[PDB]
Design a protein around this ligand. Structure first.
Ligand code: 7QX
Ligand code: AKG
Ligand code: FE2
Length: 280
């Protein structure tokens, strides 16, 4: 079975769904489709996702295979081979200008500002006072969050699930996928996410679920996975998290209606605990 998702577009007033009920369903499901702006070139990102794992013999992006987590002082970044079919290149915004090719950093900036606009629509729909958005979002209601532009390749020769079931860590994931494999578990049945290369997939992460757990319409971090791939597959995603630097962590908060924000845990703590549960 395949999920019937709502489609939205960024317009003059923010996220535009077909109607208010459609937006309600999309937000309650925790996953929806977002039209890719026509001016936005994704071809360099798509090529990077197809090449990053192939090593320095493959121009212009294969060389990023050689950049392991040590080159960054942050074990989460660089090239990672996972226990599932997936292998990844992960890089946080603070390194894009220095480390990514210039056109890949440009892509990451476009996606940051786009995700910024998406997140502020969601925050307004949740009824959180505007002056709490910055702390509630760890800077992502502006542009001071932590942002990962992450590229994925599924090694079909590996006899694993493509990517185990998990929820994302942060507030918003903007996912660029062009092939089948992504599945979501809204309402206790797994469903394929329909493929539409003219749309991003948008879903919420654990920090959105924590943030809104006490609101009148709590939003959920959708459980999703990538089924076992018989041929190779690639994708990439822009992930927005509470500012989670090694030295400067913005914290994870739950909004208490009529009271304010209360601290739950750290942003890096959440990413580490989540990343443990997925792969072990
Ligand atoms: C360090 C992860 C970063 C915060 C971000 N947050 C996610 O939740 C996913 C995690 C995943 C499943 O892609 C790792 O394999 N990706 C990302 O880039
Ligand atoms: O490759 C995909 O479609 C999903 C990737 C993903 O869910 C992730 O990296 O967290
Ligand atoms: Fe994910």
């Amino acid at each position: 079975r395949t999920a019937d998702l709502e489609r939205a577009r960024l317009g003059d007033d923010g996220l535009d769904f077909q109607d208010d009920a459609a937006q309600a369903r999309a937000f309650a499901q925790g996953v929806f489709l977002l039209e890719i702006p026509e001016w936005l070139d994704l071809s360099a990102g798509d090529r990077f996702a197809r090449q990053f794992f192939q090593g320095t013999g493959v121009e212009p992006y294969g060389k990023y295979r050689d950049l392991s987590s040590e080159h960054f002082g942050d074990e989460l970044l660089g090239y990672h081979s996972r226990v599932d079919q997936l292998e990844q290149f992960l890089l946080e915004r603070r390194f894009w200008g220095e480390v990514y090719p210039s056109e890949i950093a440009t892509l990451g900036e476009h996606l940051t500002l786009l995700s910024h606009r998406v997140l502020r629509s969601v925050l307004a729909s949740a009824g959180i006072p505007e002056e709490d958005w910055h702390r509630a979002s760890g800077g992502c209601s502006e542009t001071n969050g932590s942002y990962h532009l992450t590229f994925n390749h599924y090694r079909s020769a590996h006899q694993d699930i493509g990517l185990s079931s998990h929820k994302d860590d942060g507030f918003i994931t903007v996912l660029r996928t062009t092939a089948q494999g992504l599945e979501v578990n809204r309402d206790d049945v797994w469903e394929k996410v329909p493929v539409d290369p003219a749309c991003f997939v948008v879903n919420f992460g654990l920090s959105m679920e924590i943030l809104t757990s006490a609101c009148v319409t709590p939003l959920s971090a959708i459980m999703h996975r990538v089924s076992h791939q018989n041929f190779d597959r690639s994708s990439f995603g822009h992930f927005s998290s509470s500012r989670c630097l090694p030295g400067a962590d913005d914290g994870i908060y739950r909004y208490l209606p009529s009271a304010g924000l209360e601290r739950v845990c750290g942003s890096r703590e959440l990413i580490e605990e989540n990343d443990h549960e997925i792969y072990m």
